[PDB]
């Protein structure tokens, strides 16, 4: 019933643009929305986010997260490792590449979501969520070598999966950070399960 | 180590603005970013809420109540947690219970409320509280629940069993063009992984 009539460019930056979207509401009344898009997309999705499950025998299973200064937020954020998909890169390949660059871990693909939306009332941005396991007992993951590209400055934080939500809440209390909504949602469901 | 140096307005709409952000990198080098922000944030601890609504009924499996709506930024239908912006002076909890009733008809009971969490922190400063609400589906109030959508809100309610959430989302995505929200997907994935 609903659909886009037209899109007017408001402002285009290098990396982001702002549009005025004209759409038909279900009643046949025309309405407008203000919408954000990235200028970088081709591709399945703008990006990937990796859920990295670090598995070491005789240890609690951990979820590997990253902490970074985020200029839009004006502060530090705790997130899944993540980046944009290169032109002609598959989402699986982007996940393994970003996971290594940001954490130094080398992982295996467990599963890969369809394109999911980041903030659909605001932007068209989408990602694929990629669950990856990291055999933490392999030699290649003994001393994880992170390969940060230009301007990336990433701290790695591994938290136990079985208490993820209490651990995150504790970092927020102590360290003045913003947890990512996807990280939080995952953590919540771990507790809400069963 | 890192901090904001300046925020230069590039373009302001009615609802969203684009900024040129200048920040200090941890090597002591000045860099720039492009940042999205809403124009509607006041003294709220976040822009918005999203509601995790757990529908509970005797002799039923627990459902997660979701909503499907057309999203002009995406140009299509999206399946999401019930959500909306927090009104000036309104608490995140009150906003959650109000949005849940408006969008689904249900009258919930607060269970938990997250700290403010970031929606897409490499892009925007937008934040929400994730509010877990239980719905007593045996209460007569929640028997024949009628949405009270505000002007231009057009919302369908989709209740799915918690114990099969990911597969049930996959089956909806198999049957039409629709995008699942990344927070919904993260939550469904954790329900599987636990
Ligand atoms: C980025 C956008 N957000 C909204 C929105 O959700 N609004 C609901 C209350 C005021 C505006 C647009 C109408 S455009
Ligand atoms: C909204 C923005 N996103 C990025 C980003 O993550 N980029 C990674 C490759 C292209 C730029 C900015 C540098 S500004
Ligand atoms: Cl797993
Ligand atoms: Mg990244
Ligand atoms: Mg990276
Ligand atoms: Mg809403
Ligand atoms: Mg609403």
UniProtKB/Swiss-Prot annotation, chain A:
Location within or outside the cell: Nucleus
Origin superkingdom: Eukaryota
Keyword check for Ubl conjugation: yes
Coiled coil: none
Positions of modified residues (Phosphotyrosine): 60
Post-translational modification: Phosphorylation at Thr-32 is required for homodimer stability; dephosphorylation results in destabilization of the homodimer. Dephosphorylation at Thr-32 promotes the ATP-synthesis activity.
GO terms under biological process: ATP generation from poly-ADP-D-ribose; chromatin remodeling; D-ribose catabolic process; nucleobase-containing small molecule metabolic process; nucleoside phosphate metabolic process; nucleotide metabolic process; ribonucleoside diphosphate catabolic process; ribose phosphate metabolic process
Gene3D superfamilies in the record: Nucleoside Triphosphate Pyrophosphohydrolase
Residues that coordinate or bind Mg(2+) 1: 82, 102
Entry binding sites for Mg(2+) 2: 98
Location of Phosphothreonine modifications: 32
Record annotation: effect of changing residue 84 to A: Reduces affinity for substrate about 6-fold
Pfam families: NUDIX (PF00293)
EC number: 3.6.1.13, 3.6.1.58, 2.7.7.96
Glycyl lysine isopeptide (Lys-Gly) (interchain with G-Cter in SUMO2) cross-link, chain position(s): 29
Protein residues bound to Mg(2+) 3: 98, 102, 152
Reported impact of residue 32 to D: Phosphomimetic mutant; unable to generate ATP in the presence of diphosphate
Catalytic activity line of the entry: D-ribose 5-phosphate + ATP + H(+) = ADP-D-ribose + diphosphate; ADP-D-ribose + H2O = D-ribose 5-phosphate + AMP + 2 H(+); 8-oxo-dGDP + H2O = 8-oxo-dGMP + phosphate + H(+)
Requisite cofactors: Mg(2+)
Keywords: Acetylation, Hydrolase, Isopeptide bond, Magnesium, Metal-binding, Nucleus, Phosphoprotein, RNA-binding, Transferase, Ubl conjugation
Physiological role: Enzyme that can either act as an ADP-sugar pyrophosphatase in absence of diphosphate or catalyze the synthesis of ATP in presence of diphosphate. In absence of diphosphate, hydrolyzes with similar activities various modified nucleoside diphosphates such as ADP-ribose, ADP-mannose, ADP-glucose, 8-oxo-GDP and 8-oxo-dGDP. Can also hydrolyze other nucleotide sugars with low activity. In presence of diphosphate, mediates the synthesis of ATP in the nucleus by catalyzing the conversion of ADP-ribose to ATP and ribose 5-phosphate. Nuclear ATP synthesis takes place when dephosphorylated at Thr-32.
Entry similarity comment: Belongs to the Nudix hydrolase family.
Protein name listed in UniProt: ADP-sugar pyrophosphatase
């Amino acid at each position: 019933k609903q659909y886009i009539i037209s899109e007017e460019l408001i402002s285009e930056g290098k990396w982001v643009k702002l549009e005025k979207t004209t759409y038909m509401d279900p009643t046949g009344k025309t309405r407008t929305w203000e919408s954000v898009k990235r200028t970088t997309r081709k591709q399945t999705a703008d990006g990937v986010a990796v859920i990295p499950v670090l598995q070491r025998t005789l240890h609690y299973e951990c979820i590997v997260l990253v902490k970074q200064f985020r200029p839009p937020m004006g502060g530090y954020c705790i997130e899944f490792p993540a980046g944009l998909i290169d032109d002609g890169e598959t989402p699986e390949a982007a996940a393994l590449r970003e996971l290594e660059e940001e954490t130094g871990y080398k992982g295996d693909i467990a599963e890969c979501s369809p394109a999911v939306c980041m903030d659909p009332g605001l932007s068209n941005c989408t990602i694929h969520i990629v669950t990856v396991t990291i055999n933490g007992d392999d030699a290649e993951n003994a001393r994880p070598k992170p390969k940060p590209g230009d301007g990336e400055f990433v701290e790695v934080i591994s938290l136990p999966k079985n208490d993820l939500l209490q651990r995150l809440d504790a970092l927020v209390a102590e360290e003045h950070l913003t947890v990512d909504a996807r990280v939080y949602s995952y953590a919540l469901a771990l507790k809400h399960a069963n």
